[PDB]
Design a protein around this motif. Structure first.
Motif, short mmCIF file in Angstrom:
data_model
loop_
_atom_site.label_atom_id
_atom_site.label_comp_id
_atom_site.label_asym_id
_atom_site.label_seq_id
_atom_site.Cartn_x
_atom_site.Cartn_y
_atom_site.Cartn_z
N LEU D 44 0.82 -1.20 0.00
CA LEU D 44 0.00 0.00 0.00
C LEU D 44 0.86 1.26 0.00
O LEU D 44 0.81 2.06 -0.93
N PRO D 48 7.63 1.89 -4.32
CA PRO D 48 7.85 3.05 -5.19
C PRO D 48 7.34 2.82 -6.60
O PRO D 48 7.30 1.69 -7.10
N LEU D 79 -9.09 14.21 -11.36
CA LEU D 79 -9.36 12.82 -11.04
C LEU D 79 -8.83 11.89 -12.12
O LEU D 79 -8.14 10.91 -11.83
N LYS D 82 -5.17 11.59 -12.07
CA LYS D 82 -4.66 10.87 -10.91
C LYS D 82 -4.35 9.42 -11.24
O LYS D 82 -3.38 8.85 -10.73
N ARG D 144 9.15 10.48 -8.94
CA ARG D 144 9.48 9.11 -8.54
C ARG D 144 9.41 9.06 -7.02
O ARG D 144 10.40 9.27 -6.32
N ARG D 146 7.32 7.43 -3.23
CA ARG D 146 7.28 6.22 -2.41
C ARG D 146 5.93 5.53 -2.40
O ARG D 146 5.87 4.30 -2.41
N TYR D 148 1.38 6.55 -1.57
CA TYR D 148 0.26 7.48 -1.62
C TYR D 148 0.60 8.71 -0.79
O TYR D 148 0.79 8.61 0.43
N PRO D 150 -1.14 12.34 -0.29
CA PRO D 150 -2.27 13.21 -0.64
C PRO D 150 -1.83 14.64 -0.89
O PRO D 150 -0.69 15.03 -0.64
N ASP D 162 -3.47 14.37 -6.01
CA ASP D 162 -3.13 13.27 -5.12
C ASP D 162 -2.08 12.37 -5.75
O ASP D 162 -2.37 11.61 -6.67
N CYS D 164 -0.06 9.20 -6.25
CA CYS D 164 -0.26 7.78 -5.96
C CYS D 164 0.89 7.00 -6.61
O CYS D 164 0.77 6.47 -7.72
N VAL D 168 0.15 -0.55 -7.01
CA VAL D 168 -1.02 -1.33 -6.64
C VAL D 168 -2.22 -0.40 -6.49
O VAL D 168 -2.13 0.67 -5.86
N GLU D 169 -3.34 -0.78 -7.09
CA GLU D 169 -4.58 -0.04 -6.91
C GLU D 169 -5.33 -0.53 -5.68
O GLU D 169 -5.79 0.27 -4.87
N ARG D 170 -5.46 -1.85 -5.53
CA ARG D 170 -6.05 -2.40 -4.33
C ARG D 170 -5.42 -3.75 -4.02
O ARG D 170 -4.84 -4.40 -4.90
#
Ligand SMILES: [Mg+2]
Lengths: 50, 147, 322, 222
Positions: D44, D48, D79, D82, D144, D146, D148, D150, D162, D164, D168-170
Motif C-alpha cells: 500500500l 515506489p 481525477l 490521478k 518518482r 514512495r 500514496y 495526498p 493526489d 499515488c 497497486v490499486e487495491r
C-alpha cells in the motif's frame, strides 16, 4: 468511588483503553472497555454432549 | 480388502482415512436441526466442512433463522444416505433455497446484529474527520486510502 | 534516497532486569515501523524454541492425583510449579534432571542436580515444601526442547510409553517470551527527518537471549518470505513416480532386527551383515552357520521371520545402490 | 523441531491480466495473518513507482473553475489524471505536455511521445471536450515517489493532485483454514491484488517480498 479507586492506580477513569488488533497492528478507534471480570465454567461442557 | 480390516483402519485413523473422508463428503449434504422445531425452517440442509473440537459451527444468519442463540443450545445432525435423499436435501432444504418464511413473504435471512452495527458504523459521517474534502478516483482508491 | 532506501540495524540490547529486555531497531524508513513491529511481535509470541519440562517421575507416587506423606502440596501443585519452572539447555535437545531432597523446608529449583549443558534460569522458584523431618523426595524430570505449545493429551505416540506408571505427563508450555510490547519513535538520524526507531521490550522467561530471539525471529520471517520472493506456479505432486521397489531395510545390517549380540556375531561368523544378502539365504545355511543350535537359532527364527520378511527370498534386484 | 513449514502454493489466477489472485498453502498457525498484513502494508504505502503530481492548465490555474470547452469540471480532469499510470525510465522526474484540439475525448495517447516515459494505457480517456474550436493545453509533472501522498499533505501558483506512487490499486488478503494429514488447521493465504498494469500483480508481490527481505537482511543468520 470507582473513579477514585482507579485514580489510586495509574489507570484511566473512563475504564476504557486504546487497544490494538493483534492481527494488523493498528489500533481500534473508540477506546474499548477492558477490565477484570469474574468468569465461571458450567458443567454443560461439550464432551458430555457430542 | 476385508470389511474388518477397514474397521481396524478407521479405529486407528491412518493418515489416509482423513483424505478419504474429505473426499466422500465433498458434495454430500447434511441436515441440521434445532430441538424445538416450531416451523419448517427448524431443519435445514448444509454442506459440512471438517473442523476441530466438538462444536458444530453454523452460519450466523441461519442461526437467526433457527431461532437459535449461542447460550449452549444444542443441535442435532442427520445424514441423508440414499441418493434421492441427498439430491432432495440439495434441491429443497438447502439454506440457499429457504430465504423467505412460508408464513410471510418477508426474507428470513436478516442480518440480526454485530453486522448492522458494523455497517452502520461504516456508513456515517463525522463533520470533521481526517480526510474530509478529497476526491477519489473510485471505491478501491478509498479502500486503499483507508487501510 | 528516492528509491532503494537504507536498511536498519540493531543498536541496543538494553536489559533492565533478568527478563524484561529492550531492543531498539533503527532506522526504519516509514510505515515500516508498525510493519516490522507487529510482524516481529507475532513471530516472537508465536514460535521460539523453548525447553520447558515435559515428562516427570517421582518414585513414591503413582498418578498425579495422589499425595505423598511429607510434601505440603499435592502432586498436581508440584506439576504445575514444574511447568512454571524454566531452564536453558545448551548441549543436547532433550535431557533428564534428577532432584533429590530431604529435610524440612522449601524445595526450590537450585536443589536439583544441575549439569554443565543445563542451566537453571532462576533458582529461587519454589517447587514444593517438605514439612517433616524424615520426609524426602526424589524425582526424574524430562526436559525437551520444542517450538510452540503441545498439550499432554495429543503428545501420546504409542500404547506403551505411558505404561511406566510413574511417568507423569506435564503438558508442555515452552515459549520463552511472555509479552512483546513495542512502539515507534522519531529516530535521531544524523541528517534526515521522521525516520522511525522501533523500540521493542520483551518480557520473557529469561531463558532465551533478547538479541538472539530477535535474530531468530527475523530468520524465521525471512525464510517464510522466501516462499514468494520467487513465487511461480509450483506443485509438489509429480504423478506416476518411478522408483525401484527394493525394500530399504535390506540395506541395513541384519543386527538391526532387535536381537542379541551373540547371534549378531553368529551372522558375523558367516560374514553376513547385509539383509539384502541374507535375503538370498534360506534356512539351508543355519545349522551349518557356526554355532546355531537352539537358543541363538530361536532368536534368529523369532526376531527375523516374524517382522513380515522371510529368511531367504529370491530376488534379482540388488543392491541399488550399496 | 525448530524447523517451520513452507507452503506448496496452488494457484496464480490471472483474471483480466491486471487483477490477480494468488493462493498459498499451507502456513503455520498464525503466519498467514502476519505475512498477509506485512505484504499489504508494504504494498500500500512503501512501494515506489511513478505518477503525476503537478497539473498546470495554461489557461486556468484553479481547482475550482468555470472553464468552458469541456463538459467536465477541472475536478474531473484532476481525477482522471490521478490514475494516468506512466512508467518512467532512468529519469526521476519529468514533465509532459498535452496540447490538443478537436471534438471529443482528449485521451492519453495524445501526449507528446517522449523517450523517457511510457504510458500504460494510451486508450485512457482524460477529458471530453466541446466539439468545435476548443484547444486547451496543460503540462503535467510526475515524480518518482514512495507511495500514496495526498495533496493536503503536500500543500505547503501551481496546482497539486493526489500523488499515488504505489503501482497497486487495491490489495486484500484473506486467510482460510487448510488441512495437513493430522494437523488441525494451518493458515491458507489468498491475496487478491489489482494494479495499474504498469507491473503485473505477481511481479508486484515479488517486488514487495524482495524489499521486505532486503530490509530484514540485517538480522538473519543464514
Ligand atoms: Mg438458547
Amino acid at each position: 468511588e470507582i473513579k477514585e479507586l482507579l485514580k489510586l492506580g495509574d489507570l484511566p477513569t473512563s475504564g476504557q483503553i486504546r487497544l490494538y488488533d493483534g492481527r494488523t497492528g493498528e489500533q481500534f478507534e473508540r477506546p474499548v472497555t477492558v477490565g477484570y471480570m469474574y468468569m465461571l465454567k458450567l458443567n454443560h461442557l461439550v464432551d458430555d454432549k457430542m | 480388502t476385508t470389511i474388518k480390516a477397514a474397521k481396524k483402519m478407521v479405529e486407528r485413523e491412518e493418515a489416509v482415512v482423513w483424505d478419504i473422508l474429505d473426499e466422500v463428503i465433498r458434495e454430500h449434504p447434511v441436515l441440521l436441526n434445532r430441538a424445538p422445531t416450531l416451523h419448517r425452517l427448524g431443519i435445514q440442509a448444509f454442506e459440512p466442512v471438517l473442523i476441530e473440537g466438538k462444536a458444530i459451527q453454523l452460519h450466523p444468519l441461519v442461526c437467526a433463522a433457527y431461532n437459535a442463540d449461542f447460550d449452549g443450545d444444542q443441535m442435532a445432525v442427520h445424514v441423508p444416505l440414499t441418493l434421492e435423499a441427498q439430491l432432495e436435501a440439495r434441491a429443497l432444504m438447502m439454506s440457499t433455497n429457504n430465504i423467505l418464511s412460508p408464513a410471510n413473504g418477508e426474507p428470513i435471512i436478516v442480518p440480526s446484529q454485530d453486522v448492522v452495527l458494523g455497517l452502520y458504523y461504516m456508513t456515517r459521517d463525522c463533520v470533521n474527520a481526517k480526510g474530509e474534502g478529497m476526491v477519489l478516483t473510485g471505491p478501491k482508491e478509498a479502500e486503499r486510502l483507508y487501510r | 534516497s528516492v528509491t532503494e532506501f537504507l536498511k536498519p540495524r540493531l543498536v541496543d540490547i538494553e536489559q533492565v532486569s533478568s527478563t524484561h529486555a529492550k531492543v531498539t531497531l533503527e532506522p526504519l524508513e516509514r510505515g515500516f515501523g508498525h510493519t516490522l513491529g507487529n510482524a516481529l511481535r507475532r513471530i516472537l509470541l508465536s514460535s521460539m524454541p523453548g525447553c520447558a519440562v515435559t515428562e516427570v517421575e517421582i518414585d513414591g507416587v503413582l498418578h498425579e492425583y495422589s499425595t505423598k506423606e511429607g510434601v505440603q502440596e499435592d502432586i498436581l501443585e508440584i506439576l504445575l510449579n514444574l511447568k512454571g519452572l524454566a531452564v536453558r539447555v545448551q548441549g543436547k535437545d532433550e535431557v533428564i534432571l534428577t532432584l533429590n531432597k530431604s529435610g524440612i523446608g522449601p524445595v526450590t529449583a537450585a536443589d536439583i542436580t544441575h549439569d554443565g549443558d543445563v542451566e537453571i534460569v532462576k533458582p529461587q522458584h519454589v517447587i514444593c515444601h517438605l514439612t517433616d523431618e524424615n520426609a524426602s523426595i526424589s524425582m526424574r524430570i524430562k526436559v525437551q526442547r520444542g517450538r510452540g505449545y503441545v498439550p499432554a493429551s495429543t503428545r501420546i505416540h504409542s500404547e506403551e510409553d505411558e505404561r511406566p506408571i510413574g511417568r507423569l505427563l506435564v503438558d508442555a508450555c515452552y515459549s520463552p517470551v511472555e509479552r512483546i510490547a513495542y512502539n515507534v519513535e522519531a529516530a535521531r538520524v544524523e541528517q534526515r527527518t521522521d525516520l522511525d526507531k522501533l523500540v521493542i521490550e520483551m518480557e520473557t522467561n529469561g531463558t532465551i537471549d533478547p538479541e538472539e530471539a530477535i535474530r531468530r525471529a527475523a530468520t524465521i520471517l525471512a525464510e517464510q518470505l522466501e516462499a514468494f520472493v520467487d513465487l511461480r506456479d509450483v506443485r509438489q505432486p509429480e504423478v506416476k513416480e518411478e522408483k525401484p521397489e527394493f525394500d530399504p531395510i535390506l540395506l541395513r545390517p541384519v543386527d538391526d532386527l532387535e536381537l542379541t549380540v551373540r547371534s549378531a556375531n553368529c551372522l558375523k561368523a558367516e560374514a553376513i551383515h547385509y539383509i539384502g544378502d541374507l535375503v538370498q539365504r534360506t534356512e539351508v545355511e543355519l545349522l551349518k552357520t557356526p554355532n546355531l543350535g537352539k537358543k541363538s537359532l530361536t532368536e534368529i527364527k523369532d526376531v527375523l521371520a516374524s517382522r513380515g520378511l522371510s529368511l531367504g527370498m529370491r530376488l534379482e534386484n540388488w543392491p541399488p545402490a550399496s
